[PDB]
Amino acid sequence: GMINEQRLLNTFLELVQIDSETGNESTIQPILKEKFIALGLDVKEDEAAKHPKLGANNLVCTMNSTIEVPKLYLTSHMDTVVPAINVKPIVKDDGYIYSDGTTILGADDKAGLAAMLEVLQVIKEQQIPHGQIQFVITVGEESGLIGAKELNSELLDADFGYAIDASADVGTTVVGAPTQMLISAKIIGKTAHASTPKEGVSAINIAAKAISRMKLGQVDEITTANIGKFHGGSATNIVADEVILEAEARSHDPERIKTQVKHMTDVFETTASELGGKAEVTVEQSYPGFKINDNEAVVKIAQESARNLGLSANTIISGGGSDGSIINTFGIPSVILGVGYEKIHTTNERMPIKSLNLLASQVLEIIKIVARQ
Amino acid sequence: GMINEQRLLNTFLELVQIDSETGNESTIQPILKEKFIALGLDVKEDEAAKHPKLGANNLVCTMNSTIEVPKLYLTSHMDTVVPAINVKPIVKDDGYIYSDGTTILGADDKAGLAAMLEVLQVIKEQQIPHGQIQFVITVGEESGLIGAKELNSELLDADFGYAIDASADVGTTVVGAPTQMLISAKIIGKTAHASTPKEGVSAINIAAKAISRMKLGQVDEITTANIGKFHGGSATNIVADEVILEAEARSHDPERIKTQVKHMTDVFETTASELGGKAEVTVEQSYPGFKINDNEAVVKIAQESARNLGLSANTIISGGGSDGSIINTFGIPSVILGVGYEKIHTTNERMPIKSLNLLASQVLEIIKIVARQ
Ligand SMILES: [Ca+2]
Ligand SMILES: [Ca+2]
Ligand SMILES: [Ca+2]
Ligand SMILES: [Ca+2]
Ligand SMILES: [Ca+2]
Ligand SMILES: [Zn+2]
Ligand SMILES: [Zn+2]
User: Fold this and answer.
1) Domain that holds residue B365
2) How far apart are CA A216 and CA B9, in angstroms?
3) I need a surface site. Which of B1, B65, B120, B226 has the fewest CB within 10 A?
4) Nearest to B39 by CA among B64, B67, B6
5) Spatial CA neighbour of B25 closest among B75, B76, B78
6) Cβ contacts of B228 on chain A, cutoff 8 Å
7) Do B262 and B334 lie in a common domain?
8) How many A from CA of B325 to the centre of ligand 7?
9) CA of B111, nearest ligand number
10) Is residue B282 less than 8 Å (CB to CB) from chain A?
């Protein structure tokens, strides 16, 4: 075929053996920079390292057009979740790459990086004509898309592109994603001895009553909410005067997320006030939602590339975020390609070899389709 | 007049400055033993020190009759709550003894001990006739009446007596105290990503809903219940699969405490099961309740002693336990005398000097009244 399977596997295995836990990207980043320079790209850094939760700058690597056709970008993230120091990957007879059980594999997202490096090597050695391609390697994706948020957008020059970073089968494309917001609550009551409970106001009882009347779980077909953490109270014989709650909400409609966050806020505040306490609520947007139209070129090209390789060509809506959630806010239409990694963020993480081969073949195919528009 | 007020004050100050945080009674215990022996008492020790939460044995100190009249016992506890290392008491012009604000005072319960020692010294030096009196000095009262629970009851020989350890004005007598039970619940759900909440079952939602269904606070006129601790969940983006609740219940009716604890147990178990989780509920009796009939000799002698000293002579019901709650289970009618200590278990704890004088005078009067019967 086109891609070198043996080389792609070796690249992937090399990459997972470079320690890059999120916020500690300073080892992997110079190595990736030098690899993309070695492949003939002009590699530029932004100033993301200045952020105190990030260990190196983002990389924006540009390959000149050798044809005019559309300007493409591709993105993967160089960081992994914890624990991912000294990953010892094992290729098995079942056709899956595993960790040894002591770490994550870091297929999320070094499969995406291995796929990008293999494709450039294939393009070089076969002189495949192509348009302009940007390879955007981010830091801190696993700390809440922080590299993407600190990205110098003037370094980008693209009509559309692809985040190689969806939890879906290879050939499935994520065409929309939700807005996510964090909602935290501090519920204050009044301390008393537990024998004289009329002298106090229990923040545990207020928080429990609030939660019991709150729209939570699958709030509707396109909206979710979850209380992740509930902590409060020091002793059985004391009326609890403080509870801390940490929650989230997600929706694919911006008006529904607004209503849901206001709802949670108001339920906490008015339940606490009714029972003689008070609620301090604070909110933070993690990322904004998007939906790319089904007839946009970026979608149809993704689908054609899947069809050409005998894959589903399905388009789905994700339950969460990626760097494409942020890059979409720059006005560059972006969809998220299935990588086919499994059990990510756990020490059982694994990568099917056939999926790595197809992903690499798909990214090549996308570049060729864009090159013939 | 009869109690030596300065000597009483000096004895109190001496005792508070000997560290006896609960479980670390090993230093104060032999110091107290020598004081009781030097005042002419036969002192016996049990084997409470073998208990791994207790640092010394209880002391049972017996004073033979110099008359036949009823056999009395008096009890105080030698331990204090934390923080009570390096207590630096201050006697102020407003008529109160304070700490320096970095520790508790330990008026609870060294006011009781001081009162006892002074009364013994007045009896000795004035040759006041008396019946048999036992002075029962416990350890671990502040760890849940643990020394009283380890007490060798065959060392006791009394018709009735008094725990000098109530949060009430001097001349007020506690004639009843409730049953307290601890109830703890581990609520288990099922983990899932917060974007797909139907795949999981939130233990936070279950635990909150259970609490909203439950009778809590002032359950009725003589029954209380409190959720003191509520802890669960690790992250906003994960459906929480575990919550630990720690609760209590109290009642002056031993059947209503059982009904309440069954009610709480049943609501946890049925709510968990309904919503697809489970509830593990464990119960422990901290201490049993009692109520001494108001016409009993022990109550009438406490009230008479109070009236003789110009004090209210009220009888109340307490909100909590004491060593008297345990000693009553041995069949020795016991009521709890108001000590007049204030803001106990806090670094603002204080002792009115006038209350200390009246308490020592009251204990002396009770011994005299018993000696006439
Ligand atoms: Ca930094
Ligand atoms: Ca990830
Ligand atoms: Ca679709
Ligand atoms: Ca011991
Ligand atoms: Ca106490
Ligand atoms: Zn990823
Ligand atoms: Zn006490």
Assistant:
1) 1-177+289-373
2) 61
3) B1
4) B64
5) B78
6) 194, 204, 233-240
7) no
8) 12
9) 7
10) no
